[PDB]
């Protein structure tokens, strides 16, 4: 069997390395800011990631979704901010 083409495996590795980087970036920011509007987090994450690569919003949002699933972040009651969860 084979789920993945060779080109698909390479695309998968690329994304995973971006996502792993953006997830740690986001946790770093939130650990220090504790509470943040969505807009401000996304902007900050892109600015701090710029050293490494050009993070697209869609990539940052995927990272955010993973951190919520993992229990690192809680969406605020307003539905457009996040709180860090230790």
């Amino acid at each position: 069997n084979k789920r993945l083409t060779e080109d698909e495996r390479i695309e998968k590795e690329l994304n995973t390395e971006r996502q792993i980087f953006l997830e740690a970036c986001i946790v770093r920011i939130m650990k220090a800011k504790r509470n943040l509007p969505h807009t401000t987090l996304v902007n900050e994450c892109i600015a701090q990631s710029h050293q490494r690569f050009n993070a697209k919003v869609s990539m940052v949002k995927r990272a955010i979704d993973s951190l919520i699933q993992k229990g690192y972040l809680q969406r605020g009651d307003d539905g457009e901010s996040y709180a860090y969860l230790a």
Binding site: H38, T39, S58, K61, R62, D65, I68, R75
Partner: protein
């Protein structure tokens, strides 16, 4: 507790436990089915955390007594009342909608299966309820999920979808206004880019 009330509990209990079969017999006697939205109202009222977890005698009795009910007719009237409120009251509806996720989530899981979600979504988002939206958008959402292999739904997504449909009634208010850089769950961004494809 009034004798009448304790006797209701005793009548439906299965071998020392008010279990899922007790609950099924109970709500069916009142005229409803386990899968009804009205059952969610009942469960929420009685403090259920999981549909299949037994209800403790004390929780059964105290809840009903507090609501001024001591007979099965009192109980039927109370749930009718909550059912009407679910139809009419957006705040309660929202509360019951949010409650629904955890109640139907398998205790050993973090997410629900997409099929189960659609099952409840088909009921929640009908026009007889406080959230008014076009049937096409709802069906499109179901199709998006099936077509794109979205087989589980998280609590954040479950919760945010309500807000999404609250603000976006049509497949076309979305085009006119949806912003994919805002804070919507990314699964909804994906749905957004399928919706613009089609038109």
């Amino acid at each position: 507790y009034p004798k009448e009330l304790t006797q209701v509990f005793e009548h439906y209990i299965n071998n020392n436990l008010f279990d899922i079969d007790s609950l099924v017999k109970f709500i069916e006697e009142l005229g409803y089915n386990l899968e009804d939205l009205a059952t969610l109202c009942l469960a929420h009222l009685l403090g259920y955390k999981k549909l299949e977890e037994p209800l403790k005698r004390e929780d059964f009795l105290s809840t009903w007594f507090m609501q001024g009910c001591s007979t099965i007719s009192d109980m039927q009237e109370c749930i009718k009342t909550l059912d009407v409120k679910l139809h009419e009251d957006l705040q309660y509806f929202t509360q019951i909608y949010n409650y629904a996720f955890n109640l139907i989530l398998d205790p050993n899981r973090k997410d629900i299966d997409t099929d189960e979600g659609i099952q409840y979504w088909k009921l929640f988002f009908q026009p007889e309820y406080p959230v008014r939206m076009e049937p096409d958008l709802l069906e499109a959402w179901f199709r998006f999920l099936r077509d794109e292999g979205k087989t589980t739904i998280s609590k954040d997504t479950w919760r945010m979808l309500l807000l999404f449909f609250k603000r976006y009634p049509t497949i076309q208010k979305i085009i006119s206004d949806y912003d994919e850089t805002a804070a919507w769950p990314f699964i909804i961004d994906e749905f957004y880019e399928c919706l613009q494809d089609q038109q």
